[PDB]
């Protein structure tokens, strides 16, 4: 398991009539546990997160503890092939490329 | 409870020698549940989140379901008063001001 | 001479509450790290803040 870090998650796109390029659609996702003090490889925490962690350590019990989530994304392009028409589409904010707990 | 939104959370800053201004330190927190289809008041979801929600709906079981987290911050200024010295500090990324689940 | 009187006044004005339940936690400020022109503008800022604080 280890600390908050990125990992693979992919699917396959299928159509009954046309053919899609690329086939394997890749969209990563991260998982793990980020604790106090930090033992990670991503940038340093913010002030909000350290405040929440200290509140937790003192003895309180929060209703929404910190979580590992993404903070950056990248776009993608798809091509659909069929007789009498070849089409292309571009969609932004599809692939995760960096993440850290907030 | 309701859906993902912003809520109040504040503390008191105390010092044994100097006096701090302002006293009550305010730092809101994001809390709630975001589902499918969206019934919220924040901006529309991204493509990653809808992909994850559809994966969950089909029958899969993810190891890290989407969570309500903040996405913006603001700085703050503090003043410390004591004999022979009045000091001021500015710290960024302290107060949460928006929510949206990722 | 002058600032100490301001500190005493600020301490005096902060009267304790009379509510029967704790409003929130208290935490010391220790680990969220960052003709004098200082003592000139800082006091202006402090008085501006006290203006809003005292109305409560």
């Amino acid at each position, epitope marked *: 398991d280890g600390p908050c870090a990125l990992r693979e998650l992919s699917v396959d796109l299928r159509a009954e009539r046309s053919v899609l390029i690329p086939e394997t659609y890749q969209a990563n996702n991260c998982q793990g546990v980020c604790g106090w003090p930090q033992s990670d490889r991503n940038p340093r925490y913010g002030n909000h997160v350290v405040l929440l962690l200290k509140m937790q350590a003192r003895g309180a019990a*929060l209703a929404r503890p910190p979580c590992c989530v993404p903070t950056a994304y990248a776009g993608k392009l798809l091509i659909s092939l069929s007789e009498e028409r070849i089409s292309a589409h571009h969609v932004p904010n599809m692939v995760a490329t960096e993440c850290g707990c907030r | 409870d309701g859906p993902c939104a912003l809520r109040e*959370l504040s503390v008191d800053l105390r010092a044994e020698r100097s006096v701090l201004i302002p006293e009550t330190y305010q730092a809101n*927190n994001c809390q709630g549940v975001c589902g499918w289809p969206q019934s919220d008041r924040n901006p529309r979801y991204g493509n990653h989140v809808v992909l994850l929600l559809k994966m969950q709906a089909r029958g899969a079981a993810l190891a890290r379901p989407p969570c309500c987290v903040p996405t913006a911050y603001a700085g703050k200024l503090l003043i410390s008063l004591s004999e022979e010295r009045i000091s001021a500090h500015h710290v960024p990324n302290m107060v949460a001001t928006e929510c949206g689940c990722r | 001479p002058f600032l100490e009187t301001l500190t005493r006044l600020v301490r005096a004005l902060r009267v304790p509450p009379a509510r029967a339940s*704790a409003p929130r*936690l208290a935490l010391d400020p220790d680990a969220l790290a960052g003709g004098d022109p200082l003592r000139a503008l800082l006091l202006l800022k402090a008085l501006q803040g006290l203006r809003v604080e005292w109305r409560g």
Partner: antibody, heavy 120, light 107 residues
Framework: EVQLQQSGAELVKPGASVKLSCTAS????????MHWVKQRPEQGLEWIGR????????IYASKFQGKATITADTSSNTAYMQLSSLTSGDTAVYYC?????????????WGQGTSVTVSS | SIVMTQTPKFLLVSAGDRVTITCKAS??????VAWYQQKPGQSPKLLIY???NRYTGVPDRFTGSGYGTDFTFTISTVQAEDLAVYFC????????FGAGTKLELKR
């Protein structure tokens, strides 16, 4: 962690006074108030009073006024309650408590209970 | 002072039923309420604070709701480890601790 420790059971004559104690551990009492609670076998729970160690301002209920004195000492993280003018109706169990409830977080800690008996 | 009335005063379940308890107030108490639990020979322990949140370690069976002047606390599927007495507390003024409700099983 946090732990609240109390004294042992006591038996007193009908007309004397008692002094119960409650000491914290792994915590600083200056952070928040301390409450004292009473319980009778069948009358249910009740509220006696609270103290604020930082300033020394204490609050008592409208029924226990004049026969219960709460004091605190932060040099060793301890609180005392003096109960006076016993009348054989105070035989009960007393608790030391810390309460905080807020829209986003909460904290609730209780003692172990001290039993007080009045008989001749 | 605010007076809190709790019902029912007694109960009896069959280890598979659903349970509901009501705790009405004598005056507008906003949404400051707490639901506790006390087993024999032990000190109470918080279960629900404010009006809907859950303390750490509480399973998903327990839940509560209400606002203004009516508050309710319900358990979905009773088990054999839920024999205790339940109280409702308010905090808008000098604290008051309800009256208490018992519980029993069948066989």
């Amino acid at each position: 962690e946090v732990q609240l420790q109390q004294s042992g059971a006591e038996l007193v004559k009908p007309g004397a006074s008692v002094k119960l104690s409650c000491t914290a551990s792994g915590f600083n009492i200056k952070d928040t108030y301390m409450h004292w609670v009473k319980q009778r076998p069948e009358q249910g729970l009740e509220w006696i009073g609270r103290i604020d160690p930082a300033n020394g301002n204490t609050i008592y209920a409208s029924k226990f006024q004049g026969k219960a004195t709460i004091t605190a000492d932060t040099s060793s993280n301890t609180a005392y309650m003096q109960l006076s003018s016993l009348t054989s109706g105070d035989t009960a169990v007393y608790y030391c408590a810390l309460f905080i409830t807020t829209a986003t977080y909460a904290m609730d800690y209780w003692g172990q209970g001290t039993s007080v008996t009045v008989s001749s | 002072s605010i007076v809190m009335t709790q019902t029912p005063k007694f109960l009896l379940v069959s280890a598979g039923d659903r349970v509901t308890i009501t705790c009405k107030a004598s005056q507008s108490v906003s949404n400051d309420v707490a639901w506790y639990q006390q087993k024999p020979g032990q000190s109470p322990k918080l279960l629900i604070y404010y009006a809907s949140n859950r303390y750490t370690g509480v399973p998903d069976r327990f839940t509560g709701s209400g606002y203004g002047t009516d508050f309710t606390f319900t358990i979905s599927t009773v088990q054999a480890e839920d024999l205790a007495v339940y109280f409702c507390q308010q905090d808008y003024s000098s604290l008051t601790f309800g009256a208490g409700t018992k519980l029993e099983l069948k066989r």
